[PDB]
Amino acid sequence: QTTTVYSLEDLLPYLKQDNVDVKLAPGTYNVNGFDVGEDRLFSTTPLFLFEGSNSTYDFTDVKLNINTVVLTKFGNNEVNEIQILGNNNVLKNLKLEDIGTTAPSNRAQSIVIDGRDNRIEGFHLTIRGSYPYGYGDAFGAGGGSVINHRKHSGVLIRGLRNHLKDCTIISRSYGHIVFMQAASYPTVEGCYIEGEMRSTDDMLAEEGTGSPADKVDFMTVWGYKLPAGYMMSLQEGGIRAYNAGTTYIDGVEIQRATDNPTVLNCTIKNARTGVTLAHANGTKYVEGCTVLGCENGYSIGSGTVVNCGADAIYGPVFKNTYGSDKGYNADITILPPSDAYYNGHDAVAYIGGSNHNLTFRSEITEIPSNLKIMVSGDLQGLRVLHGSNPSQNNFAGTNIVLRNLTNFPVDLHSDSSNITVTSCDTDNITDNGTNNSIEAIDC
């Protein structure tokens, strides 16, 4: 009792219905500007609004191309390609691609998951169309921007017990790739998440062209001219949780923080951060992940990161978010470089807050001269130089267990205290803190 349909026009009615089992015939389906409007197939945004419950949709060998001009076809309103509002739905195997480079009139999300107990599996997403594209967040990702933005993010997970599984999410757009707002018990599992990078030196080479960055003389939102020597993502977070948001379950509007997020066996590459769950409440659990060439590896604030790896070519594998972080437990492998080193942060980890149990493993024997494990101190972080974002730099660290099973050096700043350090070698450890103990071990 599986119904097969052969066009987007024949598909749309089933999106309103409960308990359906629908298949969209293999093929390549184009949505264009001429397809959006009053008499046209799509008169409202979101384009594909899944309102029914207990339904399954098969998109095997479906290619769905959406021209980015569609993001300008609904006025000054947010545009979403896919939004799920019902419960207990399963969508599988869709290949979806944004065509062109037109930015939203307002902003856009490819996929938004409200409701409860939904699952998207096997999707292959390619996200395009945003402004500005090519600077990451250097000229603004929020209010008071130097260059006003019209962002386009990938998958927004909200709702309750919603599940993103075995998907591939490629972003070539300024926005988060996967993020969570007001999501309770979200799970991201088995996914490949990929952005692209650009050095600040390359951006600075736009001088004299009349580019948007040139017209503001490269003055960042952080308060200083864009510094040379860093690698940025052109995207925002790889997997990022927010401590607020709006979601809709059973028609009821809800405003709440993300809580109890789980991330399992994902690979994140070339994003501003691999996994950042520090703003979520509840239990944060990250296991089996691989983060390559991100500006920041893991920042969950408090919780567990276990059996995870990250390389350190563009930024630290580990960072505490604020000086108030408490109970971050982590076992992170520093992986072999996935590309040439270009790390202006001068750190493999920045540690502060209290009551952390931290283990770093690595087989690296060629240690770049600028890379070290920092407990407290003045991080040379791209966004925290010269007193900017001061709550995210220069904080104290106390009552922390640090197992340095690597050849990287450790610098314990004067603001650190009661740090118990276990290291392969103790000769490359600087201790300027109070009541810290340094004990060597074999291997």
Author numbering: 1 to 443
Sentences from the paper on this structure:
We show that the FdlA-NTD adopts a right-handed parallel β-helix fold, and possesses a substrate binding site composed of a long groove and a unique alkaline pocket. Our structural, biochemical, and enzymological analyses strongly suggest that FdlA-NTD utilizes catalytic residues different from other β-helix polysaccharide lyases, potentially representing a novel polysaccharide lyase family.
Two positively charged residues Lys141 and Arg240 have their side chains pointing closely to the C-5 atom at the +1 subsite, hence are potential candidates for a catalytic base. We found that the inactive FdlA-NTD mutants exhibited similar Kd values as the wild-type form. These binding assay data clearly demonstrated that while our inactive mutants lost their catalytic activity, they maintained their substrate binding ability.
